């Protein structure tokens, strides 16, 4: 009884065998701004004073960033936020031992939503060091020369930032004969990897708050364990 | 269009952290069907609509049984409307009397990062990207002392 058709993830038919009809939907990884700065170090003629990775960034996100500013951090690093919508009036009941009530749903349109054409995205990744916390502990720009201060970042790969969603689903109708005669229709994804176009980093800038007129250095390490 | 420079003369006292919101006139307009729902939103509001149908495919013959003999597409009476506040500003700019001050900063910078870093616990980040802030002091609410204006 199993009959198979090819359908698009929105239910549109594909007419199998036709060339250039199946295009995969593409993700972004959750929190692209954290994974982009995979390894950040600060150098003053070598001798790296501060060095951290993306794991320190997601740890200080999980711990230090408050819930009021959670939507701000999710907008900065390019995370989808839940847009809340409403359905409409409903029947309901009131059991006490009748009333009109609206149903609230949540949906997302952001980067992590699988899309056929993901729009160009704005990453604003905050840089965290020991002198970025207190304005009284901000290091002077005149105590040491500005030439020797350098920042080195290891950007992640394109395969580490963008994943693919299956843009084709095998739709299986199945007529189970009998009384009752069930018709189970299921969908199994058809996931064949394609070639994602190369991501072009545009408007790469660093914003520095150069205002006009003891310390807490965070020491991080990464270890791999198999015991 | 494409350049909207507005000058004011009422502001004479020193200015601390400043919230600015650019609400479309259509949000509070009478002609808006969603005026009441979208009045408190400083961005361009659109509506994404779920129309969740109840699909059911039924076969009658018990012989052909490959393409269903009938289907059904019962939609709900009230479709689900999500209000999206798309951003209304691309590059915000606040120019002072003699210095450049704020020059072509993106709206995501002034709407997300500045509430995130400046303000402390007392100032939260708004969900609507149209609402934004321009900062003038290092300590907006962290202490009761002028740290810049």
């Amino acid at each position, epitope marked *: 009884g199993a009959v198979y058709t090819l359908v698009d993830p929105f239910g549109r038919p594909i007419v199998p065998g036709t060339k250039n009809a199946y295009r995969n939907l593409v993700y972004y990884c959750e929190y692209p701004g954290e994974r982009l700065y995979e390894n950040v170090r600060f150098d003053v003629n070598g001798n790296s004073l501060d060095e951290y990775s993306s794991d320190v960034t997601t740890l200080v996100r999980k711990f230090c960033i408050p819930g009021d500013k959670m939507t701000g951090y999710k907008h900065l690093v390019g995370q989808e936020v839940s847009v809340e919508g409403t359905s409409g009036p409903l029947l309901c009941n009131i059991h006490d031992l009748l009333d009109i009530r609206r149903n609230v749903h949540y949906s997302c349109n952001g980067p992590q939503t699988p899309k056929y054409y993901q729009p160009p995205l704005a990453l604003w990744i905050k840089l965290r060091f020991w002198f970025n916390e207190n304005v009284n502990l901000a290091i002077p720009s005149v105590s040491i020369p500005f030439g020797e201060r350098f920042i080195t970042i290891k950007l992640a790969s394109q395969k580490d930032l963008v994943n693919e969603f299956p843009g084709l689903f095998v739709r299986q109708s199945r007529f189970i004969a009998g009384r009752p005669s069930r018709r189970n229709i299921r969908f199994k994804p058809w996931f064949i990897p394609g070639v994602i176009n190369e991501i072009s980093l545009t408007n790469n800038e660093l914003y520095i708050n150069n205002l006009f007129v003891l310390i807490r250095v965070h020491k991080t390490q990464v270890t791999h364990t198999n015991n | 269009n494409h350049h909207d420079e507005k000058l004011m003369s009422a502001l004479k006292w020193p200015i601390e952290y400043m919230f600015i919101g650019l609400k479309p006139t259509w949000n509070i307009s009478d002609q808006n069907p969603h005026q009441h729902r979208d009045w408190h939103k400083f961005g361009h509001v659109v509506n994404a609509i779920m129309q969740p149908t109840h699909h059911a495919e039924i076969s009658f013959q018990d012989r*052909d049984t490959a393409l269903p003999d009938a289907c059904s597409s019962i939609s709900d009476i009230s479709p689900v409307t999500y209000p999206i506040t798309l951003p209304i500003i691309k590059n915000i700019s606040v120019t002072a009397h003699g210095i450049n001050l704020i020059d072509k900063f993106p709206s995501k910078f002034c709407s997300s990062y500045i509430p995130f870093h400046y303000g402390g616990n007392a100032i939260k980040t708004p969900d609507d990207p149209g609402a934004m802030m321009i900062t003038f002091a290092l300590k907006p609410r962290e202490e009761y002392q002028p740290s810049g204006h």
Partner: antibody
Amino acid sequence: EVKLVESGGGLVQPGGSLRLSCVGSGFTFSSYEINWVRQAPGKGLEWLAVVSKIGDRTYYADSVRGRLTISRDNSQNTAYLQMNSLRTEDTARYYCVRAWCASTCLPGDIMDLWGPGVGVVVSS
Amino acid sequence: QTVIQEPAMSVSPGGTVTLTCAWSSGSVTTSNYPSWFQQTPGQPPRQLIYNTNSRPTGVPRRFSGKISGNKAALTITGAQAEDEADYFCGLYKRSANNIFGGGTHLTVL
């Protein structure tokens, strides 16, 4: 290993009856449908009759509706076809075929294994 | 209402041949489910293709099925000397169930 050998056909006068018996071996005959298909010597195939898995729910072809009555006995793994009346058109090779459900369920979509064929030669 | 095949083609060994079957009146929709059968003389017919593009186990990969224009097509690419047989097309009409063609005798030279 799996076979659908059949017998019981021969030269009969027109307007007569024949009893075609098809036996099956080693393929759990009670669980698979069996059909009867006619092949004329030069006019191609022609599907005659269906009996279902249990034995009931018999549906025939339009040209031989009522003329041919099919039956099934799962105890001895046999399918019977009764040709109650025969014109001169019915001389052909008859095959008992195993056919389960792929798209069209009861008439059969995948005629997997065919019998060797029994030749009915009606002649006055 | 009947299905018609052409009487014969001839194909060279290692060549590609395309047998066609079609309704007498109307189009051959994919809901008519063409099924192609091969019958070597002295042998019972064998299921080659069912549901217009699918092959049961044991059928060689060289047979392909399609629906072109308003007819159904069996394409044999690199046909061998074992393909010289009678080829039958059958369409599933809703009322008359499977209706089989006259038969195309493929000649492998």
